[PDB]
Amino acid sequence: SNEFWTPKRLLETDDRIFLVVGGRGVGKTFNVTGEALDDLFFNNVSMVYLRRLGVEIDELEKNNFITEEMLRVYFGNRFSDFNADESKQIMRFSIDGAIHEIKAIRNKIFFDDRCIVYFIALSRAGHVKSNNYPDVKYLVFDEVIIDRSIMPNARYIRNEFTVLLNLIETIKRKREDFYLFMLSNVGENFNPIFAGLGYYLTHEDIKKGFVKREDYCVQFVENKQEELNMTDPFVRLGAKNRDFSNSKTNAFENIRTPYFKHYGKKPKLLVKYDRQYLGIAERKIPSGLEYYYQVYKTLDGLENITVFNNNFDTLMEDEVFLEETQLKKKFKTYFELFQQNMVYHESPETFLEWSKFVYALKLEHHHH
Amino acid sequence: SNEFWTPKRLLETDDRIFLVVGGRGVGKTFNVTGEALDDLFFNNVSMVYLRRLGVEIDELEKNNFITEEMLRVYFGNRFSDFNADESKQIMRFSIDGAIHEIKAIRNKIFFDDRCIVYFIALSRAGHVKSNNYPDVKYLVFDEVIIDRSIMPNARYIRNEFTVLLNLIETIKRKREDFYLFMLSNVGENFNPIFAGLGYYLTHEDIKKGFVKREDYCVQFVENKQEELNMTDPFVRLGAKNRDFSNSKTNAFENIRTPYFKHYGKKPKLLVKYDRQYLGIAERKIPSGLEYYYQVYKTLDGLENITVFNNNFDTLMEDEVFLEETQLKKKFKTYFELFQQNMVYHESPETFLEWSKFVYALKLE
Amino acid sequence: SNEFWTPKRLLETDDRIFLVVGGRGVGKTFNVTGEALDDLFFNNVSMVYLRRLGVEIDELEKNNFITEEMLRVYFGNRFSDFNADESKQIMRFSIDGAIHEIKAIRNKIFFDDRCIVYFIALSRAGHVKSNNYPDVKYLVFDEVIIDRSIMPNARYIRNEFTVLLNLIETIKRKREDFYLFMLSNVGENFNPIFAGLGYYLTHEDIKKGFVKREDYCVQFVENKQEELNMTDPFVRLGAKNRDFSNSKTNAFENIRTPYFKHYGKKPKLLVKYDRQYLGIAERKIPSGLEYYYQVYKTLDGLENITVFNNNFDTLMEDEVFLEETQLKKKFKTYFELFQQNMVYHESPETFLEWSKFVYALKLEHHH
Amino acid sequence: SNEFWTPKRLLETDDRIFLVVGGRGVGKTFNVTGEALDDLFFNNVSMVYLRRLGVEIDELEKNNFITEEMLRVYFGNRFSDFNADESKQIMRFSIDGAIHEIKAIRNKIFFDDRCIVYFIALSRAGHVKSNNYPDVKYLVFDEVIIDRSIMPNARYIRNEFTVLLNLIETIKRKREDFYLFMLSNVGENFNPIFAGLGYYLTHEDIKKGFVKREDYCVQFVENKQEELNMTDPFVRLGAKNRDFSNSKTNAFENIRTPYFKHYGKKPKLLVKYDRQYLGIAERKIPSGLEYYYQVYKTLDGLENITVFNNNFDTLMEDEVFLEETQLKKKFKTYFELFQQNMVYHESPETFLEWSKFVYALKLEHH
Amino acid sequence: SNEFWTPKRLLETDDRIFLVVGGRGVGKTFNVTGEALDDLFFNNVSMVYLRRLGVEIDELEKNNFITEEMLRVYFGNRFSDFNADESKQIMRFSIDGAIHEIKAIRNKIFFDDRCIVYFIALSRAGHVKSNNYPDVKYLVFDEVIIDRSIMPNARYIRNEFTVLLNLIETIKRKREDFYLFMLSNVGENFNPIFAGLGYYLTHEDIKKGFVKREDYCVQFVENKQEELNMTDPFVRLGAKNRDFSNSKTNAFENIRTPYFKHYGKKPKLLVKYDRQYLGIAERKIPSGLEYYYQVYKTLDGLENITVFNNNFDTLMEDEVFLEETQLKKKFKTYFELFQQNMVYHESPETFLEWSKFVYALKLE
């Protein structure tokens, strides 16, 4: 009867950055979008719908982004008779006895001849920042985490999290009131979005529906297990095929938690990042080698470890500059080892710091 | 038209899921559609026409999906004068003295400005939200089994039957009254659709027109070879070309029956699927190897056989997770061996269980 | 000119299937279309314009299919003032003092809000047969034989003739009055269309303008030698360039006649097709091998030669089934030898029987 | 005298085919178009603007093809007040006290709701109906010769000149009053257009402003040196970059002159083309071989030299049939040697005849 | 807050070529565009917005190129009530009591049915020069220098500066009053634009906000350190990610200064460019070779060293022509060595001369 998930709890807290994970088919996009229409229609505000890849937007049904059922549930009795024409891709409806119309053209949705929704893709939006969106209060990131099942080969954009942040500034031109919604159908570690936020996924946090951080709040949406009527043939048929049943809870199936271990010796190499020094230490073992990733706040006790510097300004003394060509030779193999859970991190905090560094420089990795 | 086959017998039985096989050119889709207009017009209900490949829908002439002949035979004495305009894809007709219009625009057909028929393709079925299709009582899947002659290379969607079920669930939002029609011009084993239903095609079931199961009914429609008027040149020309003539009776030409043999020895590997354990056992022979595919209800007697688990959550203890990248290597040859009839299956029931597993994970 | 060729002679004979070859620029498409308008306009009948490849239809000018010059020549004095609007793809004209309008949208042409012409492509026609073209009296297959000059690489559909035959049956359901027009700018052997008809192209048949078979008629159009006004500079320039001049007579340049020889020995393999047995025999010669393609009506004297069966139902006993993966292994090299004029055929009738078999099972080109 | 080029001199001669080369920035297209309007407006005549590649037309601004300035210079005081609407591409002006409007929509420009200018691309030329163009008196081919600078990689259409001739015949239907204009910003040998015309570019012809041939006239337009005002900052900045300055006189920089030498010995192979026999003769030299391309009218003295025939119909007697797929292997290396200036040609007449043969069958594959 | 940068100072000086570097987020394009409207509306003048790649223009929002705020800040009280319709991209407003409308369709913006702004891409600009813009006073090049971080793969157009210069002459035909603006978010050496202008970037010039050349003036805008509101979550998040924070001051982070050294010995090869001869000299060293790029005013003392000449017309006698195939064999490796700072340059002036040569003939 009532929509399972609502964005209200997230809106009530002070934080303005919300991350919603799991519960695909629950209409997260339906409810997040649904809440805003109240604002978009009469507060002279617009919304930007963000997708990672430009291909995803072209396939998206823009005529159905705002649907009659959506208007009817959020406005209810206030919503009047609705007489849309699908050939012309125009919707006419009346609210409060006042006529309004929605028409979807190109990548924009128009309400009473005013643009309320912008459809832009991160792969294309990043390439031009001269664009300017005058009034935007809501940015929504849908399917923000890659799902291997839906898409066999999908690669996160290069230095993705930084590209997104720069896009925020262009969309949000020093606006006090701005909201960001990130919606993921599946949640797992080792993505750049988690690295940027700094959130580390753990089963305990999954058990607790709500987790609180300083900058953002992440809420976990789990679709209630419903007694399935076995008199219905379609329900029985879905039950016989297990691959169908398992799809519902696949979101939190695997979180890709990484290994943790402590190693006393000093790293083979150091790289200075974020007023910090990252080091990798190798321990020789009979079968091969064992790799340990560490973070050092200071260089005390590490006189002779070579230091690589990514940034030109911060370089000083003997540290060697790190160029695009150089970082591949030294760190290509180390990055591949990082992506897979083949390495030991001293603590979860160090894993986040390393994630920020790795996902900034990750590139290509196609057929390698 | 509707003379040979009617869906009325299927509607008369209790089951709500129907599989119709064979009898191409008999207007199966015409009559399933034909019966439903009765509801679509006046019971405030709609229908969805489902095709596997988006190409099948784009090329389909949607304005003629509902034709005057159809309207006239199903409404009969009620049907009045009919004045259609083809340019705007509008039909004007009166039933019971009430004027109505059917307009087809884009992938939807409207009856009195209400959508009664939706045209959607299974390849695109993903990213279709339930709000787009409010009221649907009928889903019709046409040409559900691949035909080798019509299309040279056509591949069932990866994990297709699961894709279909999600489409069922999205379209049918806990609706008690829902009907599924699966219409196939040709019937043969080794497709995912038969596997999903759990139906195994056999000549005995083909001779008996109707087979009932717990969830569905499958009815086989075969048109008897009709005397061809040899005065018409087009008919005369078709007779001279044999590949065309054999196409008429192509539906049940080959049912792809698979080999069956039993091997006592224990399997080489185990993979846990569907609350069960599937194993492949190899018997060495002078020329090479002989393959036996088995199903184990339980692990009794199989202490140390390695177990691969498709699902991460259910995995436990010594079972090693099987991810898609690591999976290809192990089961590539076994999947090739399954698709080509090169392995021995213990029984048809195990063959069906293996079909579910294979077609869920198949990749070309 | 438009008055050069007329389909009238073809219509006068009883046969309903016509194959027109050669004479590029003679307006075969213009006149075949021209004859029908009387029917399309006033007999509540429609026409289907069929092309092999979807590329041919998308590039085709939908608006210019029916032109003012066309309407005027076939209707003449009956044709009234003509006031077309080029922007919106609309034509308004009056016939017998009655106003009519022709509009072209997407792949259809409409006359008085009724669809008279359908544009559909054979490559896409196979995917869907449930479509309903309600009333069709005319089906036109244009540029039915591939010309390498116009199109460097063009591939016939796999099992093409059956795709076409299925399309005939889908378009023409229950119609006593139906006409098929096949129009080729160039005529040559070794195409699947000729194989399906059973017609074998020969220089003698080209000399006689008209040939009659049981099912169809083939008429050969050769453009009469025309006096070239030298005085015109553009005419003088075209003469200097031979590739331009040779294009005019390109239709019958090469008819791809195949070699014929008889070999007594029995074949290496047999394949059963059309209640007959086709065989290939190899004769070893010092330089290499010599291939002979034969047809046997019966198995008498061929006890132990292996027999391949294309169709599963008819297969029996010692015959080994021929699957798609199998025929490529056995017959890929033999099919290559057939396409290139490298084998000896016993007679033209066996060549046709072999052509039907090859083009039914032919491998899809690599790409 | 008159620093501004006009097509009047070209129009005065009898010939109807004109090739204009060089002088980029002189407004060749501006004046060729400009001269015709009197006919287009009041003689019920249309013009066709032809470009090799569709890309050139799509980027082209069709509205400004006919501009107010163009109208004023040719019509002058006779031209009245002009109040055009740029949004809808509708211009408003009166001539001789009669109001007129020119509206540009899609690939056509309409004058008083009548089409006077057609914009069509040679790449897209296929499947255009002759009837579509009832009356066309002017065909203008702009940038007809490829310029290496404008486009890093640019390819002439396969068998282009034959493609052009088919398009000429379709547009023109025994029209006595028909004109062909070919405007090229750069002139050089070894293109199919020169091969088709039969024109061989030579510096003497460039020094002589005007050249007449049987079918056409070629006029060379050279823009005078204009003392460049240094006061403009843009001009001084251009001076520092030399690659920019040389572009103005780039047209006649390189004419691709081919080597000429005569060789007495008889050829190695013969191929029959155009009722003629082409031959390639090789002279052995210490470093390698020397190639001489010759043309023979008759086979006298050439008894046993093999003859290849491209066309099956004309084939006869001892000639061995050569098919398009087989033809390339035999002549691939010889064709490569022709395109790069590495062979000796008997005369310019033979060089053109070889060009016609090569450009008809030259093909690239991968 | 307040526009950190305004174009008025640049407009005040005589020179007509301005190069603006750095200060991302300052609305350089916002203020340059804003200043011109006074001219575009009432001086019967137009403007051309230049982007390197056509991809950059298609993604650009033509309706938001001119925004109500920009209108409001530059005209202020003069601006009246504004009620635009975004559906058709038509704005209506009144200035000085006179009603006007600007409608943006395709790649053009029209003011009172007159085109004031043209959107063209440099990659496509070459192929069509016949296009004639009757009145153009402003040409603006935005993001003129490539930024490696924002765009993964970005190529300077081959011979870009000449392509731009040819475009200048076509757009500006005999116009005395013309202004060119070049706005770059990042400033670094080794781009063709700096080479074409002849400006050599140096940190000393970065400290001084304004640098004056003869042909042009270049102004450097660095966005002053502003206290970041740490109540805003987005600002708090950016501080944690260092790569994001550096982006604002990334412009002048690295200028790619090249090494400079003089070598007396004569070069291996000479290439004549701009009535001068560039030479590369190799000194054999144990690890490998050391490359020195030099400029010679005359050939005295270099009688027999090979000379490559780029232009055929100027080529004469012993000079060897430099063709597309020939320039790949000799100079492919030398160009790779130039792009990376692996070579020694005699002076900064010679480096610019080598830059003119390299970026004119470089191929990717």
Domains contained in chain B, CATH given: 8-248 (3.40.50.300), 269-361 (no CATH)
Q: What span, in angstroms and rounded, lies between the C-alpha atoms of B54 and C242? A: 47
- Show which subunits contact D, needing at least 3 CB pairs below 8 angstroms: C, E
Q: What span, in angstroms and rounded, lies between the C-alpha atoms of A156 and A137? A: 26
User: Which two tokens mark E37?
Assistant: 């409207």
Q: What span, in angstroms and rounded, lies between the C-alpha atoms of E361 and E350? A: 17
- Partner residue opposite B162 with nearest CB, options A232, A243, A253: A243
C249: which chain D residues are within 8 Å (Cβ-Cβ)? 313
Residue of A nearest to E243 (CA): A162
Q: What span, in angstroms and rounded, lies between the C-alpha atoms of D270 and D302? A: 9
User: Which two tokens mark A209?
Assistant: 């529906």
A234·B312 Cβ contact <8 A: no
Cα four-point dihedral sign C234, C240, C241, C245 = positive
- Specify the 3-state DSSP secondary structure of C278: strand
CB A20 within 8 A of CB A186: no
A60·B127 Cβ contact <8 A: yes
Closest listed residue to residue B124, CA positions, set B32, B42, B64, B51: B51
E313: which chain D residues are within 8 Å (Cβ-Cβ)? 246, 249, 253-254
- Interface contacts B/C by beta carbons within 8 Å: 104
In what order do the strands lie in the sheet containing B138-142? Answer: B79-82, B90-95, B98-105, B108-111, B114-121, B47-51, B138-142, B179-184, B17-21, B216-220, B210-212
D236: which chain E residues are within 8 Å (Cβ-Cβ)? 214-215
CA dihedral A10, A15, A17, A19 (to 10 degrees): -40
In angstroms, the Cα distances linking B103 to B48, B71, B87, B110 are 16, 14, 11, 5
B169: which chain A residues are within 8 Å (Cβ-Cβ)? 234, 238
In angstroms, the Cα distances linking C67 to C57, C72, C76, E14 are 18, 9, 13, 63
E180: which chain D residues are within 8 Å (Cβ-Cβ)? 234
- Partner residue opposite E87 with nearest CB, options A113, A163, A197: A113
CB C108 within 8 A of CB C47: no
What resolution, expressed in A, was reported for this entry?
2.9
A87: which chain B residues are within 8 Å (Cβ-Cβ)? 103, 105-106
**Residue D62 dihedral angles phi and psi, to the nearest 5°:** -70, -30
Q: What span, in angstroms and rounded, lies between the C-alpha atoms of B208 and B201? A: 12
Start-end of H helices in chain D = 8-12, 28-42, 54-59, 68-75, 160-171, 192-197, 203-207, 233-240, 242-246, 324-339, 348-361
Residue of B nearest to C193 (CA): B241
- Show which subunits contact A, needing at least 3 CB pairs below 8 angstroms: B, E
CB E65 within 8 A of CB E75: no
CA gyration radius for chain C?
24
- Interface contacts A/E by beta carbons within 8 Å: 109
A131·E240 Cβ contact <8 A: no
What stretch of H or E contains E352? helix E348-361
E61·A103 Cβ contact <8 A: no
DSSP state of D78: G
One DSSP character per residue, E234-271 reads: HHHHHHH-HHHHHTTT-TTT---PPPB----SPPSEEE
- Partner residue opposite E59 with nearest CB, options A108, A127, A198: A127
- Partner residue opposite D237 with nearest CB, options E115, E133, E197: E197
Closest listed residue to residue C98, CA positions, set C81, C119, C76: C81
What stretch of H or E contains A51? strand A46-51
Q: Are strands A216-220 and A210-212 parallel, antiparallel or unpaired?
A: antiparallel
Name the burial class of residue C244, with classes exposed (0-12), middle (13-18) and buried (19+) by CB atoms within 10 angstroms of its CB.
Answer: buried
Q: How close does chain B come to A235, measured CA to CA in Å?
A: 9
CB D282 within 8 A of CB E340: no
Q: What span, in angstroms and rounded, lies between the C-alpha atoms of D221 and D237? A: 27
D159·C87 Cβ contact <8 A: no
Q: Are strands D269-273 and D307-309 parallel, antiparallel or unpaired?
A: parallel
CB D255 within 8 A of CB D204: no
CA dihedral B155, B159, B163, B166 (to 10 degrees): 170
C69·D216 Cβ contact <8 A: no
Supply angle C-alpha B185, B186, B190, rounded to 5.
135
Contacts 24+ apart (CB under 8 A), C7-16: C7/C31, C7/C32, C7/C35, C7/C181, C8/C35, C9/C210, C9/C219, C10/C217, C10/C219, C11/C35, C13/C212, C13/C217, C15/B233, C15/C212, C15/C215, C15/C216, C15/C217, C16/B233, C16/B234, C16/C178, C16/C179, C16/C180
The residue assigned the tokens 């832009």 is: A120
Q: What span, in angstroms and rounded, lies between the C-alpha atoms of B249 and B121? A: 27
Closest listed residue to residue B362, CA positions, set B157, B99, B152, B123: B157
Residue of D nearest to E16 (CA): D233
E113: which chain D residues are within 8 Å (Cβ-Cβ)? 84-88
Q: Identify the contact set of chain B against chain C, taking CB-CB distances under 8 A.
A: 29, 53, 55-56, 59-61, 64-65, 67, 85-88, 142-143, 148-152, 232-234, 236-238, 240-244, 246-247, 249, 253-254
Q: What totals of helices (H) and strands (E) does chain D contain, helices first?
A: 11, 16
C168·B234 Cβ contact <8 A: yes
C254: which chain D residues are within 8 Å (Cβ-Cβ)? 312-313
User: Which two tokens mark C365?
Assistant: 């080109």
C17·B234 Cβ contact <8 A: yes
- Partner residue opposite B60 with nearest CB, options C130, C158, C356: C130
- Interface contacts A/B by beta carbons within 8 Å: 84
CB B190 within 8 A of CB B355: yes
Q: Identify the contact set of chain D against chain E, taking CB-CB distances under 8 A.
A: 25, 29, 55-56, 59-61, 64, 67-69, 84-88, 142, 149-152, 233-234, 236-238, 240-244, 246-247, 249, 253-254
User: Which two tokens mark C172?
Assistant: 């023409």
Q: How close does chain B come to A341, measured CA to CA in Å?
A: 14
- Partner residue opposite D162 with nearest CB, options C229, C236, C241: C241
Cα four-point dihedral sign C323, C325, C327, C329 = negative
Q: What span, in angstroms and rounded, lies between the C-alpha atoms of C341 and C257? A: 8
Residue of E nearest to D238 (CA): E165
Q: How was this structure determined?
A: X-ray
Q: Is there an interface between D and C (3+ Cβ pairs < 8 A)? A: yes
B53·C127 Cβ contact <8 A: yes
- Specify the 3-state DSSP secondary structure of C92: strand
E252: which chain A residues are within 8 Å (Cβ-Cβ)? none
Q: How close does chain B come to C237, measured CA to CA in Å?
A: 46
B131·A237 Cβ contact <8 A: no
A241: which chain B residues are within 8 Å (Cβ-Cβ)? 161-162, 165, 196, 274, 356
Q: What span, in angstroms and rounded, lies between the C-alpha atoms of B289 and B297? A: 26
Q: Identify the contact set of chain E against chain A, taking CB-CB distances under 8 A.
A: 1, 25, 29-30, 51, 55-56, 59-61, 64, 67-69, 85-88, 142-143, 148-152, 232-234, 236-238, 240-244, 246-247, 253-254, 340
Q: Are strands D136-142 and D179-184 parallel, antiparallel or unpaired?
A: parallel
In angstroms, the Cα distances linking C190 to B147, B288, B312, C195, C354 are 27, 44, 58, 7, 10
Q: What span, in angstroms and rounded, lies between the C-alpha atoms of B359 and B341? A: 15
Q: What span, in angstroms and rounded, lies between the C-alpha atoms of E139 and E141? A: 7
B176·A249 Cβ contact <8 A: no
- Specify the 3-state DSSP secondary structure of D102: strand
